[PDB]
């Protein structure tokens, strides 16, 4: 089941719908894909078969 959403996830008593920074965080975070890294941070293209 895929899930695409950009809604802010709240982690406090106060509700978050369009405010973030103090206790609510953006759900997406980007990979820092660089070739200067070693083995455990390289981008691996993974394809599945079901």
């Amino acid at each position, epitope marked *: 089941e895929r899930d695409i959403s*950009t809604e*802010i996830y709240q982690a406090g008593n106060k509700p978050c719908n*369009g*405010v*973030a*920074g*103090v206790n609510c965080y*953006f759900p*997406l975070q*980007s990979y820092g894909f660089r070739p200067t890294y070693g083995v455990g941070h390289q981008p691996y293209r993974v394809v599945v078969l079901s």
Partner: antibody
Amino acid sequence: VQLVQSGAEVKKPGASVKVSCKASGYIFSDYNIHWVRQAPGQGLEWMGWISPDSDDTNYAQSFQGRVTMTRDTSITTVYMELSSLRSDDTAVYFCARSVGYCSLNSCQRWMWFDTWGQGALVTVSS
Amino acid sequence: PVLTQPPSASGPPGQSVSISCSGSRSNIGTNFVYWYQQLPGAAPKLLIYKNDQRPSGVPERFFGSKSGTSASLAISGLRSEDEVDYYCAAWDDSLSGHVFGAGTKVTVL
């Protein structure tokens, strides 16, 4: 590194003007570029971005058919074309390079213009 | 869309002055906001990225942070470099691209 660009001069309205930006030193297959203009009496304005390793093209919400992008990978230059120049467009166009790489619409949250280049003032008067 | 900025903010040397940059619900509060300054007759550079840190070659006196839907920038020490203008760069989804403020002019008493 240096990000020198070539300017133009005054011209009649409604024609086409050619400005180019040249890149050197760094490899021109990993960094996106951004094009911003700065007019006297107002702040900076954004138009769009392209990719040197792909044919990605994005436009602003106000400039959809007025401006078109052109890429030259082998020459390592980028060519900007402005069509149907108005009266309130006398600005300084800056060739700005951003670190990282983005192609999706939502990718642009982490983009900052790190290495700027010197701008040139262009005007359109008949 | 665009962001509201004060046309002119000034402060005497020896202390710090604050520059505010407000925003809407989809301008600041869901995306990062960046601070840009430019010398007169030159190119802009980078001061603040990801709202907390600075690049190399930047003194530690330049600090900025945000709490809610607005961000503030504080500068301490105004002798020759803080007379330049500042810009409030952010990102949104309505214009589908980078948006900039009107511009803040900083002087000294």
